[PDB]
Amino acid sequence: RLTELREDIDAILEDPALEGAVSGVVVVDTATGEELYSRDGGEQLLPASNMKLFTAAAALEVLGADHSFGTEVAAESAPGRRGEVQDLYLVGRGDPTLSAEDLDAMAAEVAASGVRTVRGDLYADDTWFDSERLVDDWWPEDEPYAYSAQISALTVAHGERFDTGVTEVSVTPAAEGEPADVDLGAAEGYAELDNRAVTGAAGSANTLVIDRPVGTNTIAVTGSLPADAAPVTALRTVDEPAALAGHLFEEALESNGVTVKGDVGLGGVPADWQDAEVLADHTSAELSEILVPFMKFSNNGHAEMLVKSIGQETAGAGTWDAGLVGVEEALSGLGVDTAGLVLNDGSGLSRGNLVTADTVVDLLGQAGSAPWAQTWSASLPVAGESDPFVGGTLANRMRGTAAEGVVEAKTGTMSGVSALSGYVPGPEGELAFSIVNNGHSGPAPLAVQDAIAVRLAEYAGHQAPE
C-alpha cells in the first residue's frame, strides 16, 4: 500500500516531459494526518492559478459565505414635475456578476421612480476600489484577452461565467473580396473599431486576428475569414470597465424611456450630496454561490476583485496591498504557516507569486475544517465531469478512471508552470495533494498529473469504470 504507492509516484515523475522542471509534489491523509508522499515540498514555486485556493480560503474568512455585492444609481435630488434630474452616477461596489440585464432592470427602476429626463451628464463611479487596473508585474501583451481584464469596482460581466471587463466581438463572412462584418458586442459605440478583415475564398486559410493594441480602446481586426467559414466570436477586454458599464446603462435608460442629454463619463459622487436620492439598486448572489463560477473556470478578474474586496473590509481600501495583507493574515488566523508564501495577486497571473507544495497542502487541510468547508470543496473542479459547471478545468481529464467524479482539485496553467492541488475522498482515506511544476519546456505535464491523481483515486479505494 503506502510502501507501494511511493514507487508508483516516483516512476510517474520520471517522465521526460519533466526534464529541467522542478516539481513540488506532496500528498497527505486529511484523516490520520499521515504524510503519504513528499518531494521538494518546501521548494518555493510559482503557483499560477493555484493561488486562487489561498484567495478563496481568505474571502470566505473575511467576507463570509453570505457576502453580497450591491450596485446603485443616484442623483443629488429625486425628480418631480417633468420628472427631470441633472447628473446621475452609476455606483457599483465590487459586484463580479453585473449582468447586462441587471443594468436594464435598474434602467427601468430609474424610470419607475419618475425620472424621464437626465438633463445632466451620466457619470460612472467605481471608487469603492482604487483605479489601479492591472497588477504591476502582469504583462501588457496579455492585456487584450479576458484573462487579463482591467480591475474596476464597476464592471459588466459577460455570460453565465461572468467574464468581467470584456466584450464579445463577432466576425461574420461575406462574399469573397468584400469586407467582413464585425460586431463589437457590448463595446459597440464605446470602443473604436478598425476593420481591415476581408472575406477569403471558400475553403481558404482562416487568418483572422482580433486585437486591442496596447494603450488604446480600439478593437482591431486584420487578415481574412473564408466565405464558407462559420461566424467567429471572441472575448476581448476594454479599457476602463466602468466607462463601458456607463455606456451600456446609458443605452439601457434610453431603452426605458429616459432621455440622457449630457455625456457619459468617469466620475464619483460629489461628496457634496451627503444624502443623495438612490433611484435604484441591485444585489447579486452570495459569495457561496459566486464561488462556483469562480473556482471552476478560474476567473482571474474575480480573484482580484475578491482581494480588493477584502481590502475594503479589513481596512476600507479597495487595493491589492491592503487586500493581500488581509489574505496573508486571514490564512494565518486559519492556522496556515505562511512563511514560504509570497502574495503578489489573487488570481495567480503574477510571476511574483510563490508557494510550496506543503503550504498548499497545509491550506487544503485547514480549509476542510472551516465552517465553510462544504461551499469551498464544492466550488472546486471535479475530474472527468462533462458538465462545465461541475468539471470545470477538469471536464476533459481523467474521464473513465478512478478519478472520475471523485478528485476535487484546482488547476494552474502558465508558460512553464502547471499545477494540480486538491482532495481525493476515498473510503480508504480523505486525501489532500499538491503537484506544482515549474521549468518544464514543453506542454503542461497533464498526463503526469492525471497519472498521480488517478493513482491516488485508487489508493483511496476507487475503481475505474467498465
Ligand SMILES: *C(=O)[C@@H](NC(=O)Cc1cccs1)[C@@H]1N=C(C(=O)O)CCS1
Ligand atoms: C491560472 O493559472 C489562470 N491562467 C492564465 O490566465 C494563463 C496566463 C498566465 C499568464 C498570462 S495568461 C487560469 N487557469 C487555468 C488553469 O488551467 O487553471 C487556464 C487559463 S485561466
Ligand SMILES: [Mg+2]
Ligand atoms: Mg453600445
Ligand SMILES: [Mg+2]
Ligand atoms: Mg468512485
